[PDB]
Structures are given as C-alpha cells and as structure tokens.
Amino acid sequence: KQPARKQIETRPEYEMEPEQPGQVYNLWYNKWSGGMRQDPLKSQVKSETRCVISRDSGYTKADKNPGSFFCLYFARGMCSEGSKCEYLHRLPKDTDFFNANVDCFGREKHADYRDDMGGVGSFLRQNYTLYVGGITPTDDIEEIVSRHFAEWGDIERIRVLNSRGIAFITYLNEANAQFAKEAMAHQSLCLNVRWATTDPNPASQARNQRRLEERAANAVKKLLPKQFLLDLEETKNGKSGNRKRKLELEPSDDLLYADGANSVHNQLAAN
Amino acid sequence: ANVELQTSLGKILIELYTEHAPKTCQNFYTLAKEGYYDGVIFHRVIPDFVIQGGDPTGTGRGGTSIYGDKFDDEIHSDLHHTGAGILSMANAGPNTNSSQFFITLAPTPWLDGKHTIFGRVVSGLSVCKRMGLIRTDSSDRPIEPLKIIKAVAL
Amino acid sequence: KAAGINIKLFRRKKNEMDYNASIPFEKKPAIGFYDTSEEDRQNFREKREAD
Amino acid sequence: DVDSTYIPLWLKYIECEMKNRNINHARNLFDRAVTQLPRVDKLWYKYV
Amino acid sequence: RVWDMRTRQNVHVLSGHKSTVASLAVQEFDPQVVTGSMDSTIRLWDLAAGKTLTTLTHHKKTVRALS
Amino acid sequence: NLLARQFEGRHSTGVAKQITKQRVDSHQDLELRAAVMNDILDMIPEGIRQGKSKTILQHLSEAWRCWKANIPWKVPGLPAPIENMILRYVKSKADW
Amino acid sequence: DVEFPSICERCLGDNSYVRMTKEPLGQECKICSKPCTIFRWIKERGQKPGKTQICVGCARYKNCCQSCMLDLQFGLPIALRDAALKLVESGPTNDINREFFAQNQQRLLSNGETAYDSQEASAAARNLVKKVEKRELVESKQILKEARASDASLNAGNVSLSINMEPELADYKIRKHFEQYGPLKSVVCSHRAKCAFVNFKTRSSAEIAAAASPLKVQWGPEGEVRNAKLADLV
Amino acid sequence: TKLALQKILSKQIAQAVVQQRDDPVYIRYTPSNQMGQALSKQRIIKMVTAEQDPMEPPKFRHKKVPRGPPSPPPPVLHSPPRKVSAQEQQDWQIPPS
Amino acid sequence: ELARNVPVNEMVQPALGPANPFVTKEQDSIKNSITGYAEREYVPNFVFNQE
Amino acid sequence: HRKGLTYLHLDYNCNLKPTKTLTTKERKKSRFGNAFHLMREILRLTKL
Ligand SMILES: [Zn+2]
Ligand SMILES: [Zn+2]
Ligand SMILES: [Zn+2]
C-alpha cells in the first residue's frame, strides 16, 4: 500500500560476441550467426536478478488506467522506472480477466503454440499448467518447488517427478500462470520453464475437461433467464407436480426457457 | 365441407368446421372452388410450430379473401389448439384475417386467442410431419419452393 | 520401457501433413433421400469402440 | 471425384457399406449410383 | 482459355473437363462457348461468368467435331 | 523482380515453359504419343477391355525402329486397324 | 461492399462515435493464413489502439469478435467455448489441413447456409449447466502390513486408526482453510497420494490446529499410495 | 459480356504507380444484443483508408493450395450397351511386343 | 430499392404471422455482419467532429 | 544478409569478397544475378 520502487538502477546494455573467432552479426535477423549451432539448451544462462511481490509491489502510474497491463520487466525484476512506469508493478489477483487474444501479461497470443513451447500460449487452447524443469537435488523437490511457486499466484495442482527434475505446477488462472512462467525463467530454485503438453492420461484428460465445463457453467449461468435459473433449484429442492398444472393451464424446454421478443412469456403477460 | 390439397410432399385432406365458424370457412371452401391456390408456396415452415402459406405473392404478405382485404374472426370456448394438425388462420391485428392459413404441428395452448380455428386434418398428417423436416434457410422459409400443385375441394 | 522409461516420443519431420490430426482432405458423402440420422450417431460409442 | 465412371469402385464402396451394417448409407449410395449411371445394369441388379 | 485480343490477357480459364478439349465453338448468344472433349462430354459455358451451364453426356467416345 | 522473389517465393507452379530448340524432339514425342492414345481409345469399340494402350505404343516404337533400320516389321497377331494406324503414324514421323 | 468488421461493443468502446482506419491486405489471418484487412481504432483515450486479428471468413465460422476473440453470444473465450459446449466439430491444428478446411468451409458458408444458429447454442448451454449440477451431487490384510511397519522402522476385516497430539479438491482450498489456524509457509499435496502436509511459522499454531480434532486427518508414485488405498477400508 | 470481361480485365491489369485515393467514408452502425446487456446506442463510424508506404515490398509470401473438389458429375445418359461376343473380344486381342 | 412511389398510410408493412416464439434475442435483430447492421451515411466532417 | 550469406563481405568500395573458403553449397547459394551486380557497380561509380 506504498509506492512501487525501482529494482535496477542501471540499464542493462547490449554488448556481446559469442565464439570470438567464428561469429558475425547478422543485420537483418538481429543475432550472431555462423559457428557451431551449440546445444539448443545450453545458452540458458541463469538470470541475475530476481523479484518478490512483498518488497517490490506498489503503486504506479498505470494503476489509474482500468485496462493497464503488468510490467514485462517487474516479473523478471528489471523494471528500472519504478512508480513512473506505464504498467502495473503489482501481482495479478483473482478478477483480472483480459481479452482472449491478448496475453494476460501484456503480450499477444499466437495460434501455433510453437514447437518448443517457449514464449506465449495459444488462444486456440486453454491450459493453465506449465512445465518447469531443472535441478533434481534430493527428495525435498516437492517442498522446494511449492515454496518457490506459491508466492506467484494461486495453485490448483502440483505434480513433481521424483526420478528427474520435472514439475508441472497447475495454476488456477491464466494471469498467475503466465506471470509465474515469466517470473521463474532462468532463476534459481537455471530453470527450464516451458508450456505443458496435452495430457496422455485418459483419466487426467477427463477431469481437466470436467473442469472446463464447470468454468463454462460459472461463466454462462449469469446469462441464462431467471426462470431457468430458479427452476434448476426448485426441482431439486421442492415438489414437481404441483406446478405442472399451472404450466398445463397455459410444455417444452426450448419453448419455455427462451428469451427474445414474441416468446411465450412475453405473449402470456400481454394477453 | 371438405378440401383436398395436392401438395408437393403428398396429399392433404381437410374437413372444415362449418358448424362452429361458418363465415371464415366458406371463403376457404369457395376459394378452393376458384382455386388460385394453384402454385402457392408454403413460405413459412417452423419445426414443431406451424406451416403457413396461402399468399399468391409468395412474400409472406398479401392474400385476398372473398370479402377482399380482411374480415372478422369468430372464436368460442370449446375450440383449442390441443393437437398437431389444427388448421387455423393467419392475421396481423385484431380482425385482419386474409386468405392465408397455417397448420399446427404441436400443442399451442397459448395461441387460442386472436387466431381462428376452422379445420382438422383427418388424413395426410404424415405429410405435415415430413414438412416439419424440410430444409429451411435463416428465416422461416424453405429453400426449395414448396408449391401446392392443386387444391381440389370436395 | 521394460525397466525404466522416459516415455520416448517418435520424431516427426518438420515437413509433414501428419495424416492423423484430421482427415487428409475431409470430403463427406453427399446427403440423399433417406436420413442417416441414427446410423452413425446411434453408435458414436461404436465409432470409438470398434476402434 | 477422380473418376465416377469406375463401376468396380462403386461396387467396392457399396460392399464395404454392407460389411459394416450401414444399410441406409448403402441405399443412399445406390440412389446416387443409379441416378449417375442409369444404363449400367450391375448397379440396378445389386439394388433390387 | 479466353484471351483478350488487345492486351494478350487470359481473362477466363474454363476448367471443367477431365481430358483434352478436342473441339470448340463460339457464338454471340448464350451459350457463347461450347467445348467438346475426350470425356465424351460437351459443356456449354457462360462466358460472362466463366462457369458451365449445361453438360451433355450423350456421347460414348471423344467428341472431335462441333459445328 | 528480385525483391518480389525475395519476399514472395518462386511462384513456380502454374507457369508455362516454351519449347526452346532443345525440347522440340522430346515434346514432339509427347504430342505423338497422346495422339496415338486418342486414336486407340476411339477405334476400339465399347466393352473391349480398353487396357491395351501401352502395348500398342511399344508396337509403334518398334515399328519406328524397324523403319529406321530398314527391316520389314511384320507382326502376326496384330489386328488390322491397329496395324494401319501404326503405319500411318510411323509414316508421319518418318517424313518429319 | 467490404463495408465493416464484426467487432463487439465491449471492445468498440463506450463512445457512440469512433474513428477507425483500414489498410487492405495488410495482414494474414491468424487462422486462415489468408490476406485480410486490418481495422485500427481507439477504444478510449489513454489506451493503445486495438486492431482486428482475424479475417471476416473467421469470426463468421466461429461467431466471434475479430479483436478480443470472444464469442458474440456468450462472451467467453472461443477455445473454452469449443472445448466445453462442443457445439459443432472444429478444425485441425496443423497448418495445411486447417487452411484447406477454412477455405472450403468459407466457400460453403458463403453458399448461403449458416453454419451457426443460436437455438442449439442456448440449448447446449442449458444442458451444460444441468450436467455440471448433476456432477455436483484376507487379501486386504496382507497389503496392510507389507510396508506400513517397514517404512516406520526405517525413518519413523476392519482396522481402526489412532489420534495423536505429540508436538478433485485443489490446494488453495487447503490454503484458505488454515489461515485461521495460523500463518502459512507452504502446503505440499498430491491427489494420488491424498496426503497434504502443511507448514506454519510456529509449532504452536500447528498443534492448536491439531487440537481441533474430536473428513479430516491429524498428522514411482505408487510407493506413496500404499496407505492411500486405506481410504476404502478406513 | 462486355462489362463483365472488361471488369475482369481491369482487375487483372491493375496488378508500380503510387496509389493516391484518400477519402473518408461514414458508416451508420446498429448494435445487436450480443451478450444480453442492454443492446447499445446506434453508432456512426468514420472510415479512412490508411495510405501505404510506397517503398514496402510484398507484405507476405504466397503459398500454393491443392485445387478444391469439383461439382458433382452429371448423369451419363448413354445408349444401351451392345453385345460384342467372344469372337470380337478376341479379334481385338493384341500380341505382346 | 423499392420502385413504386406510394402514399404513406399503407407504410406500416405488417409481417402477418403468428410470431414464431422459438427465436432468441440474438436473431431478433436484422443485420448484415455478424455483429450488427451497418450502412453508409453522408455526414459532413465538421458536424461529426464537433458532436 | 536475409539470405544467410553473412560470410560474404561487401567492403565500402562495393567489392563482394568471401571472408572464408566456400564449399560447393555456399558457392552455389552465394551466386548473385546481373541486377544485383549491375547495381553494385553503378554504386561503385557513384562512390568514386
Ligand atoms: Zn513497470
Ligand atoms: Zn471484441
Ligand atoms: Zn480467417
């Protein structure tokens, strides 16, 4: 409840030449080319900076705007403008929905969902769990990852592989999930954080898809007509035949549980 | 009072309720006698609600009775839409009945108001049940023309 | 897989139609006078279950 | 689509529909076949 | 193929046959282009839209002459 | 054109290729083979097991080689219409 | 006449008068991968301009908003909609098949027949909420002591457990349960193991939480599930 | 036919000169009860065609797509097939080369 | 593009039907695009800008 | 660049010289056309 503070006083400048003899900068694709491809998963250099909400979050100029996005750099912890910044420096909360196209972290979501599951999810599929990989020190991997992940958001499921350093924390919301993905990359618990793949478990897929229907039901029940909503519980918490006579006085679901002009309910009152 | 309707899907037979509503049935009877219902499209077909038709224009509007523009509807208590096949009239106001009519496909108890009931389909109900499955575009209108080849009254 | 597996997944080439995500060209039989209706949906259980 | 005049392919399709108990599909297929090739009697004979 | 004389442009590509178009005929009234091919099928074309109107399959072998 | 090919691709499909004095013979061969297939498909009556084009083309090629080498090329079982058509096309090729 | 793009009024701003630009063929549809025109407008002062993300062939096959990717009838993400409602079969996820399906589907949709009617959608929604509410409502003895004593020695028809005071359901439910029993440090759980172990700042808070005792417990993967099968014979 | 072919020809010919056509277009727009809510007031929206950079190369690649299925074939309508007999079947039997 | 100029009093233009009740609120509205009805209007710039 | 030919050096006098020995693949890929070379030489004259 205090103004947000700047993390990095300096600006990290770009000057670096890999493989001193055999690399040359490429002007079109702004990256060094030539030389040994080198392990695809070797460049990963542990991140230097790290952030926590407690000592860093606070007010910023973006809190005023209702549709403002979070700092791409607060989560990774090099937002060097502090409260002057144009993005929120606080943590996503439960009701921080954004549009489907836009990434909840301020970026944009493509459709191909990549191949190495690297940067940003796809709007075509709705997943809240992300692969985190890296160190496999001892059996206390479960507790260390729980400690290092719960402070980024609300958690629904954690599954950690004992044999190898693989964990699959599942978040409740897209906002917290993607914030954690961008906040736990190249950090110390370097972590190889990626997006999760479709479950091959016939049992896990069923419960995930059931979760999808319950999220849909929570979304839609605010839109269905009031009569349908109330009758849903009147049938389950009261007798049924006592009102069919009133219905028989004036009997299908689509005919009766329907809105729009010239419907029976509008016609019944106007008679 | 009895009228056959030679429709594309099949054969439709209607017995008129002359004893209940005489004025609104004589026009239909003599109208089949004149028989300009030839080549008239059932412009409106709604799954489980109605099959409306009877306008020479075919645009869902028009239709001239023997009186010429409209007339008065007569309704009394014992008439109900309790079944699927009651042959009733189409109107657009208090007393605005025209030459066009419709056939009921499901109990419409709410509709026993401003609509005149003057028929029951004794034979050919299967034809109406099939008409309920006709390809229909976005509006309540069949894509192919569901013309009435002939309407012979007997 | 016999003793302890990493669940080795097969390696597709980056240039494939994949021939498994959907029908390669997805052409449906033309609809005729008689309704299929149940003949397929009556046994969607079987569309997956014979498989 | 490649060639609709090949009678063996028509018969093969019909026969594979009889294998899997799809009788309504097969009868629609006969209707299409006989309305496409009215002057070949193999299709008519199989239909009757 | 339909070519504008002046600009050498292929405005229409009347592609409906399955084999070589062995015959041709053009007139001013619709049908404007009539093509008979190896398929034994004669196609009557709508030159304004570049789409076929009527297909004539009475022939058994390739139709080599239109007049 | 260079920038378009850089930012667009070859667009190689759907382009024609003129005959340039090196493809003349190999294209004349295609046209003659297509013409002979057409004539074969025509002179054979209905329901006479049309699967005979390749063998007749082989016969035509052998007739051409025999003419080039001045050999009679007289075949026992060949039907008269096929033999006549082959002679006709061989004479065309020889005059060319 | 290539007049207007289908955009919902939630992301068209709360101003009845907006100004927007169009550049033909300026982008490729993110589903069709077909050329499409962009429409850029300002939702409200103090916000980066929005823009359409998909062609008009899409947002017609999907009944969606070209900008915010929300369906125009239920206002919920299109992915969640097609996953839950399952109204009509979707397209593939690979490039060539999806573009072929989209192009031919756009053709047959322009042929005149609408691929989306809302009657079936409302019916499917009511069915979905109905299904959700309905969803709301000697060999055992040897698999009992096979390793229950063993692990205890290493590092520690009916059976009745014991209660000591020595000093489907997600984990956040556990988190918002133990806040009155003290501050939380970490809660490590597993659905298959059915065991949730919690940590507090002080042992006194944990012990007073344990004192609340008179479904609850007080103090490969299969190795941790041996005692979890006891729930059927607890 | 002249108008149709001329339209197609002009479209073909149009495919180097800098395009100069900028003029606002106003659209009266009517919202329709999307997510319930309370519909919305009628809106008028100003269209302005954003002019393109004369230096822009082609914006994106063009890729080939296999040709779509054709229209269903028409009925054949042949004269009844004739009988050839085994003698004429054999008289067109060609020897191998 | 109505072609016959006609006196006003017959401009009520009734649909003359039993008012199909199966339709929901989405299709009650007439539209070209998926979202709504849009049509041209020749507004001069200054009035649009000031309002 | 944008062609991957980052081993070719276009020095400031507009001479296209490889920075290393090229294999057959690289030599075939790094072959430019008459338009690029003509533009390069016109640029060289302008720079002179
Ligand atoms: Zn910031
Ligand atoms: Zn929107
Ligand atoms: Zn699209």
Side-chain angles (χ1 to χ4, degrees), chain A residues 100-101 108 123 154 210 257, chain G residues 30 67 126 135 168 172:
Chain A
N101 67 7
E108 207 275 348
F123 56 82
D154 172 80
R210 277 152 36 211
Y257 294 130
Chain G
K30 274 184 193 174
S67 80
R126 80 178 83 266
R135 271 162 38 206
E168 272 276 339
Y172 69 98

Side-chain angles (χ1 to χ4, degrees), chain G residues 151-223:
Chain G
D151 53 0
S153 177
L154 278 71
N155 220 15
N158 283 2
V159 292
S160 297
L161 59 89
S162 66
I163 295 96
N164 284 42
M165 287 179 189
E166 57 192 282
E168 272 276 339
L169 191 147
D171 306 334
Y172 69 98
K173 321 283 188 69
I174 300 170
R175 293 185 180 91
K176 59 153 182 279
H177 272 194
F178 284 149
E179 85 279 32
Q180 60 255 8
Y181 318 123
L184 272 294
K185 173 257 167 197
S186 77
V187 174
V188 188
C189 165
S190 188
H191 180 93
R192 288 287 183 180
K194 213 183 187 291
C195 291
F197 282 100
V198 308
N199 287 32
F200 302 142
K201 270 80 175 174
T202 181
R203 191 169 291 283
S204 64
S205 56
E207 289 311 311
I208 71 168
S213 181
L215 70 167
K216 67 179 75 62
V217 285
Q218 281 79 65
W219 199 277
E222 187 62 87

Side-chain angles (χ1 to χ4, degrees), chain F:
Chain F
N1 293 13
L2 179 137
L3 295 167
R5 198 176 89 267
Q6 210 59 40
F7 287 86
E8 275 185 15
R10 297 295 86 192
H11 277 196
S12 192
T13 181
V15 305
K17 266 203 302 191
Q18 59 168 239
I19 306 295
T20 65
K21 193 181 177 181
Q22 73 174 30
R23 294 190 295 273
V24 159
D25 296 353
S26 65
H27 181 77
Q28 184 269 4
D29 190 359
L30 284 201
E31 290 298 317
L32 185 149
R33 283 175 76 82
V36 173
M37 299 212 205
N38 195 353
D39 275 25
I40 286 173
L41 183 149
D42 268 0
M43 46 171 50
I44 295 296
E46 81 304 349
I48 307 292
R49 314 272 301 210
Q50 300 294 332
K52 295 179 181 179
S53 73
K54 182 179 179 179
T55 309
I56 298 183
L57 282 178
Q58 298 185 328
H59 273 278
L60 158 73
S61 306
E62 170 66 13
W64 172 233
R65 275 185 310 240
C66 280
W67 184 92
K68 262 205 292 175
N70 205 53
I71 293 172
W73 186 75
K74 186 43 141 163
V75 181
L78 210 49
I82 298 301
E83 195 276 332
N84 275 352
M85 160 199 98
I86 279 170
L87 290 188
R88 165 196 269 212
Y89 280 93
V90 159
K91 180 147 176 283
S92 177
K93 190 158 187 126
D95 285 357
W96 170 269

Side-chain angles (χ1 to χ4, degrees), chain G residues 8 11 65 67-68:
Chain G
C8 67
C11 74
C65 185
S67 80
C68 60

